[PDB]
Amino acid sequence: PLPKPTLWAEPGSVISWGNSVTIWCQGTLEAREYRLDKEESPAPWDRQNPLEPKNKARFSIPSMTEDYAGRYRCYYRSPVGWSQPSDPLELVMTGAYSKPTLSALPSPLVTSGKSVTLLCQSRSPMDTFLLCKERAAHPLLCLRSEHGAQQHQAEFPMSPVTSVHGGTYRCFSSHGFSHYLLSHPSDPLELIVS
């Protein structure tokens, strides 16, 4: 088997509508041709006669839209044949829906040891809500509230609240059936612990 190439995105896998992202696939110097499949799209989604140095291929997305969110796999051909496919790359878009609101009950000012509930609310019916703290770069990996029935809010109970929980939070809403399409992030909520 010809070993799979490596795939990544710059700046990364979470891109706001209208912003730029580049998908990079790196095989070897023996690569004669790179191809990218997008999940659920006709194959191949794109292709490149590498050059480049034939070491890597660049797939540019100048202006992100919902048509680009989802997963991608890269495979390449050398004189020997076709490679195994790369691990899939998830490309998440924010801005598919209006921003939700994020608030703290009873207050974002919390006494250490007590509890608080963060409330994320959406105008559009949503079944998935994600609560992310500062420095969380991958919203899909954040605390998640999933529901069968559509909702207009999700609660994130936090207990106990201590110094470590202090910081800035944002929430996102989505539908689980299109989980790579997120709302705009909510305005930031600063949790202040005393």
Superfamily for 95-194?
Immunoglobulins (2.60.40.10)
**Elucidated via:** X-ray
List of residues 6+ apart from 177 with CB closer than 8 A: none
- ω before 3 within 30° of 0 (cis)? no
Superfamily for 1-94?
Immunoglobulins (2.60.40.10)
- ω before 50 within 30° of 0 (cis)? no
The whole-angstrom separation of Cα 43 and Cα 21 is: 21
- Which part of the chain has CATH 2.60.40.10? 1-94, 95-194
- Secondary structure of the chain in the HEC alphabet? CECCCEEEEECCCEEECCCCEEEEEECCCCCCEEEEEECCCCCCCEEECCCCCCCEEEEEECCCCHHHCEEEEEEEEECCEEECCCCCEEEEEECCCCCCEEEEECCCEECCCCCEEEEEEEEEEEEEEEEEECCCCCHHHCEEEEEEEEEEEEEEEECCCCHHHCEEEEEEEECHHHCCEECCCCCCEEEEEC
The whole-angstrom separation of Cα 102 and Cα 108 is: 10
Sign of CA dihedral 97, 103, 108, 112: negative
The whole-angstrom separation of Cα 124 and Cα 96 is: 11
The whole-angstrom separation of Cα 7 and Cα 194 is: 44
Comparing C-alpha atoms, which of 143, 179, 173, 172 is closest to residue 70? 179
The whole-angstrom separation of Cα 84 and Cα 24 is: 17
Which residues are registered as beta bridge partners of 79? none
The whole-angstrom separation of Cα 184 and Cα 46 is: 28
* Amino acid making up residue 181: L
Pairing of strands 89-94, 14-16: parallel
| Core vs surface per residue 104-138: b (16+ CB within 10 A) or e | beeebebeeeeebebbbbbeeebbbbbbbeeeeee
Comparing C-alpha atoms, which of 40, 86, 24 is closest to residue 180? 40
Exposed (0-12), middle (13-18) or buried (19+): which is 29, by Cβ within 10 Å? exposed
75 token code pair:
């495979």
The whole-angstrom separation of Cα 57 and Cα 160 is: 49
Rg of the chain on CA atoms, in Å: 20
